[PDB]
Ligand binder design. Structure first.
Ligand code: NA
Ligand code: NA
Ligand SMILES: [Zn+2]
Length: 230
């Protein structure tokens, strides 16, 4: 019953409970004439919530906050963007205006600025080298190395064994790595291997787009990217 574009009209947001205090948020995007669902994460921390990634753009992200208040009824106090592309930082201004403290690595913030995208307010230090990990409220942030982008982060929820990969992880039904304009195809399989090695106890893996599954999404991702590199 994980929602797809056939269940979410363009511009709508849904939540899906993955585990106690862990949800994905799913929003249908329209981009370059294609329509597709994008995932992010919500994690409970006491009586507050941590948000991972926006819903792409001001209107979608406002709709996300509305859906969270309806379904969960706890305030979002902090948000993290997993890389600099407009789909993951677009909407940060809505978050910030709503009182959410927004975060990203310094690399993500620089790249977003240089692109003319919205820029998270706060820097996350300690994530500049492959294998680097930092605790942030109820999650661990991990920099696996360059993959979909050079700055991409993944997020682990230790209490629930849930890994959110952002666009560095592909769904099982995927046959291509998607937009690779800012990707490092040579490094990406190695970066996935770091994730595999560091989180061998992950039970649920959530890709940037599409259906969650188990740890096999990681090996599948490496395989697709390697086959792409042809
Ligand atoms: Na969109
Ligand atoms: Na962008
Ligand atoms: Zn991207």
């Amino acid at each position: 019953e994980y929602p797809t574009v056939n269940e979410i009209p363009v511009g709508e947001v849904r939540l899906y409970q993955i585990a106690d205090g862990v949800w994905s948020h799913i929003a249908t995007q329209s981009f370059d004439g294609a329509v597709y669902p994008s995932n992010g994460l919500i994690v409970r921390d006491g009586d507050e919530l941590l948000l991972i990634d926006t819903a792409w753009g001001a209107k979608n992200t406002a709709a996300l906050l509305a859906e969270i208040e309806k379904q969960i009824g706890l305030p979002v106090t902090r948000a993290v963007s997993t890389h600099f592309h407009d789909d993951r930082v677009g909407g940060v201004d809505v978050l910030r205006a709503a009182g959410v403290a927004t975060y990203a690595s310094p690399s993500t913030r620089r790249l977003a600025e240089a692109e003319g995208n919205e820029i998270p307010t706060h820097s996350l230090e300690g994530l500049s080298s492959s294998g680097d990990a930092v605790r942030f409220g109820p999650v661990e942030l991990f920099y696996p190395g360059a993959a979909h982008s050079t700055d991409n982060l993944v997020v682990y929820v230790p209490s629930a064994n849930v890994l959110y990969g952002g666009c560095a992880v592909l769904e099982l039904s995927s046959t291509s790595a998607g937009n690779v304009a800012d990707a490092d195809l040579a490094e990406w399989p190695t970066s996935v291997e770091r994730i595999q090695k560091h989180y061998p106890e992950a039970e649920v893996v959530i890709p940037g787009h599409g259906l969650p599954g188990g740890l096999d999404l990681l090996q599948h991702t490496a395989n697709v990217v390697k086959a792409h590199k042809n």
